[PDB]
Write a protein that binds this ligand. Structure first.
Ligand SMILES: O=C(O)/C=C/c1ccc(O)c(O)c1
Length: 352
């Protein structure tokens, strides 16, 4: 019965039961509108995503993936699911509403108009890596880290969101051919994605965090490629031509020979790109934005880097109780089974 800001974009009815009232529109998610609401039980305002995914297989897969992961994760720097609202039967289930802590902004919105102090950059980076340590400890890859997926509240607490493209790490099966299509956001893709990688190793996430650090330093994306291959040219325009050793790491001939066909490009020094940056921040940046993914710094090493010395505390940087081993591919399931799994995964929040 309750309604919010009609128009289009799948967001006429916003029916979150009696518990959640005084709806205020926030914006458009991917599968419906997002609103803040007053939680009449906890007596605080929360965020609620309306999800109407049952039309398309892809929407379903990403929705199930996120729900399974977020329900199993519990960490200060990862958004949780507080509640899920849906019909009591599969027959009647047409939408799903996901209730989460209210986070007033995200890093994308912040960077549009706000300069970050070095102390803010340091703190944000620490929180990103702290959350990522937990994710990776569960053998999970986020695979779409970017500023819009980093939520922030009014006290600068940071929570990672959107596990719709996540996968279980599988380095033994990471190899693929040259120019293999990829789904995750272009500007934050590691170079190897375009060369020989399916993005099934943890190093894929570290690259993205490096891009996020660079973006925090200057309020501009570091590698804003306009299309698939342009992205690699942006990366090489700054890192310079890869070394013989790094090139020899790429066994696939089409990828190798593409790189060999390019004119020699020298490295652009970080301190020229970011003249106001802390030198320790640039040392860490360099280690995150390493061309060779085998040489790229790992999350725990990054946390231990001198730039983050004010925050580093391994005992207060928790890991997951056990790795995830459930299917995150979800590609050989008919629409009927996907809907059923979403129904089952969301059952715990029902009065029953
Ligand atoms: O765009 C989306 O998909 C939702 C974003 C969002 C915005 C604020 C929040 O507190 C939250 O949990 C999620």
């Amino acid at each position: 019965a309750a309604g919010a800001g009609p128009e289009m974009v799948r967001g006429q009815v916003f029916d979150v039961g009696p518990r959640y009232t005084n709806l205020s529109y926030i914006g458009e998610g991917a599968y419906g509108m997002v609103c803040s609401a007053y939680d009449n039980v906890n007596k605080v305002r929360v965020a609620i995503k309306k999800i109407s995914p049952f039309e398309h297989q892809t929407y379903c897969q990403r929705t199930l993936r996120e729900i399974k992961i977020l329900l199993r994760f519990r960490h200060e720097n990862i958004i949780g699911i507080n509640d899920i609202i849906r019909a009591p039967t599969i027959e009647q289930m047409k939408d799903v509403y996901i209730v989460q802590d209210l986070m007033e902004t995200d890093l994308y919105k912040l960077l549009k108009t706000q300069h970050l102090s070095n102390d803010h950059i340091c703190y944000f980076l620490y929180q990103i890596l702290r959350g990522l340590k937990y994710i990776h400890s569960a053998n999970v890859l986020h695979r779409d880290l970017k500023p819009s997926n980093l939520l922030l509240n009014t006290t600068c607490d940071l929570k990672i969101c959107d596990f719709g493209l996540a996968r279980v790490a599988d380095p033994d099966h990471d190899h693929t051919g040259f120019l293999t299509e990829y789904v995750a956001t272009r500007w934050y893709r590691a170079p190897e994605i375009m060369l020989n990688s399916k993005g099934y190793t943890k190093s894929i996430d570290i690259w993205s965090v490096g891009c996020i650090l660079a973006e925090m330093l200057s309020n501009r994306p570091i590698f804003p490629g306009k299309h698939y291959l342009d992205q690699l040219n942006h990366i090489l325009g700054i890192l310079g031509s890869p070394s013989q050793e790094d090139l020899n790491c790429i066994i696939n001939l089409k990828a190798r020979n593409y790189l060999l066909s390019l004119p020699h490009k020298n490295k652009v020094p970080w301190n020229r790109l970011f003249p106001n940056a802390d030198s320790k921040a640039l040392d860490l940046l360099d280690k995150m934005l390493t061309f060779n993914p085998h040489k790229r710094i790992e999350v725990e090493q990054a946390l231990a880097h001198p730039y983050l010395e004010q925050y580093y505390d391994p005992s207060d940087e928790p890991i997951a109780e056990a790795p995830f081993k459930f299917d995150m591919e979800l590609d050989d399931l008919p629409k009927e089974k996907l809907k059923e799994l979403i129904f089952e995964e969301t059952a715990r929040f029902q009065p029953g």
